[PDB]
Design a protein around this ligand. Structure first.
Ligand SMILES: N=C(N)NCCCCN
Ligand SMILES: N=C(N)NCCCCN
Lengths: 437, 436
């Protein structure tokens, strides 16, 4: 059993990489429209993200159950909300991979412009998605080794900037675009939050993957908090640094700023390097997120709250069938990248699948208090405070999202409810049943 | 069976709670779409009957006070019960502002001063408290008053259906079959975004189950009867009016029956329709206030709402709760002192409308999860009807404004956080951790 567990370093890198992989290189561009004031947005986001990570860290220390959020929700609310949580999170997991692989293969267009052709891109994306499904089939040790390397590669430009970029940084440049939002301070900070709050999706990674982690009660907490802090530092330092090195006007326009900035400062080779590292960190995360999909689905299927096949494992314990299913699904959704008007269509689904993740977060936050009140001791005020901050993070993320996306999330909840009712009636155990027919 | 309410007032409470105010405004809202609304009415009424049958059957198997609240608590546990009651309660008393405003509106036919928004506000507050007080006097009282109000409100609706077919011209109805500019489906959809909300109130007898006489028998009958009444009148009145009045006049009009009546059979006819419409509108304030009281009481009795809402007088009436609802309604009724204040409050109201669909959904789920053992030979019917009721709730949301729904979602989240913060260590987990 322990022969197939993953150690602390890969898990931590899986969390940090699951978090940063997709957008760490695109953040300074996004925040360029608001300006330097974004640092206020970072400060607020990071405090809330620590809060959420501490919640997950403590919750997994008290219950290192596989499936993470799925397990915590089922524990304190029962089978229905477990079922719901897993559906939402699983969908979130594999639906979000489509964006990632497009971005990742996208970064590789630097070398092979052919990858800009929607057809070639789509096929390439499919192949890559399947590569990282097979690597998951080989086992979590494999996938976490690969993603560890990828994540480390992705950290080279980011840290290079965040350590040495400050020797070209200039505060005049940063403050020259302190607030280009045209809004007041709150509005600008808010507009920043609309970007920065989603930056830390994946905080729950090690918790969800607890069932393949070595000494989880020890390691999952450390990996959780550990990954989140790396993400935070890298985010603030990289975006702050770049905002003081490149003019706001240019920074806004670039579709690959570290890359645009790189290719034009230290030569073509520099740009090449940055593109490679970006693609590495991006495509590396496919593995982590695919892993998480498999895990949550398996954990739910083990309790009979998700189809049996997601529980069918090899001798190593890998849910191979589930992984292959997620592969087919991702393949089907990847077809949206074959045309400009085809990607426009899929977008809402992607953005909705992102809001899904927050229900698990919310239930995790609830679960810590509802399940672990007896372990707080008289540090209880602290726990309550941190958890309340965590709640605020979740709620505020949604408050600032698009009405349509959230609406469809709301619809999804109802649909999941009806699904559970129609699929699990007369299997489901009622808290307060009626008397015998 | 002394303080309890009989079948007739309850049925009239259901139909009255449904018909409420909108019954007189429907043709105007449908006029923008046109005669093709008939298809939407069809779709709406099938789903609405489905929902009522679900409620009918569920109340039969378990005539618990609080209705949906009780059903949801049964099958999903305290968290979703707490959630249901908060949502439905909010729905109940937030929804009353719009109602009393509309209702006092119709009375401006007699007293124009009622459109001075100040005077309007004051008047509305007073009326709200009138019905809080009548609810305090007791459920027999409130349901009697509403019964009468409901029979009065039917005078116009019925008369038109019956005598107005003598003035009905199909050439007029078909002149405006589809004035929506859309294809058939879109027309039908724009209809449904009006008509699906028409039947909010189906759950009334169920939630009131605790003050109903022989609820196991009467709440089902009342539940389905009320809906049948509502459906028939909705279709008949709107269809009739769409055939007697040109679409153009119909759209423009803010009070079609009233305007149509006034210039049909005199300044007296208008007065009668106005009076009856106001009766219908203001009569159901009582019902909804009652339902608020009931759901809150039922939840507080289970420790899933602040205990004061469970405090009662020697009759069992949640007096303090009713007063609290009165005060909140008063605080929120302050939104009608200007055209400016009025439109700020609209979102809250729409969201409040959406709140009611979560209870519906849970009730639908509860019937299957709880009563599967009572279906027997006819299981494929229960699954089929309950499925239609599911589709009813979900379609209603799909057709709503994105913002309204977003803010309902946010509310669910806030409710979750509140539950966790206020009930941790009172709350008992299905699968707890080992002791420290
Ligand atoms: N859902 C996914 N497959 N990925 C989400 C990655 C988000 C990076 N913060
Ligand atoms: N929530 C209220 N106070 N009223 C709801 C009225 C719904 C009429 N179908």
């Amino acid at each position: 059993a322990d022969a197939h567990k993953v150690g602390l370093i890969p898990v931590t890198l899986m969390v940090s990489g699951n978090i940063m992989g997709s957008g760490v290189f695109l953040l300074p561009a996004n925040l360029a429209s608001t300006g330097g004031i974004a640092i206020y947005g970072w400060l607020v986001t990071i405090i809330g993200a620590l809060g959420l990570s501490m919640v997950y860290a403590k919750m997994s220390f008290l219950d290192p159950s596989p499936g993470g959020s799925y397990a915590y929700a089922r524990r304190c609310f029962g089978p229905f909300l477990g079922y719901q949580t897993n559906v939402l999170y699983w969908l979130a997991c594999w639906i979000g991979n489509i964006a990632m692989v497009v971005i990742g293969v996208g970064y590789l267009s630097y070398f092979f412009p052919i990858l800009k052709d929607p057809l070639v891109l789509t096929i390439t994306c499919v192949v890559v998605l399947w590569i990282f499904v097979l690597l998951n089939i080989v086992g979590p040790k494999m996938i976490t080794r690969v993603q560890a390397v990828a994540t480390v590669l992705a950290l080279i430009p980011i840290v290079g900037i965040a350590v040495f970029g400050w020797f070209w940084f200039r505060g005049e440049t940063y403050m020259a675009a302190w607030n280009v939002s045209g809004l007041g301070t709150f509005g600008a900070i808010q507009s920043t939050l609309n970007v920065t709050l989603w930056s830390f999706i994946g905080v729950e990674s090690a918790s969800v993957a607890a069932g393949v982690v070595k000494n989880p009660k020890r390691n999952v907490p450390i990996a959780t908090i550990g990954g989140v802090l790396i993400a935070a530092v890298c985010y603030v330092l990289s975006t702050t640094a770049i905002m003081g090195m490149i003019p706001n006007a240019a920074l806004r326009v670039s579709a690959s700023p570290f890359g645009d900035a790189a290719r034009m400062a230290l030569g073509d080779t520099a740009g090449a390097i940055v593109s490679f590292c970006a693609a590495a960190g991006c495509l590396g995360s496919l593995g982590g997120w695919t892993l998480l999909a498999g895990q949550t689905a398996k954990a739910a299927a083990d309790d009979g709250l998700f189809p049996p096949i997601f529980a069918r494992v090899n001798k190593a314990g890998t849910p191979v069938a589930g992984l292959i299913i997620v592969g087919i699904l991702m393949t089907i959704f990847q077809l949206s990248s074959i045309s400009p008007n085809a990607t426009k269509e899929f977008g809402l689904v992607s953005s909705v699948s992102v809001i899904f993740t927050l229900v698990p977060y919310l239930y995790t936050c609830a679960a810590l208090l509802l399940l672990g009140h007896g372990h707080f001791g008289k540090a209880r005020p602290a726990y309550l405070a941190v958890t309340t901050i965590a709640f605020l993070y979740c709620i505020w993320a949604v408050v600032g999202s698009g009405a349509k996306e959230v609406m469809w999330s709301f619809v999804t909840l109802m649909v999941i409810t009806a699904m559970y009712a129609l699929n699990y009636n007369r299997l489901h155990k009622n808290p307060y049943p009626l008397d015998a027919p």
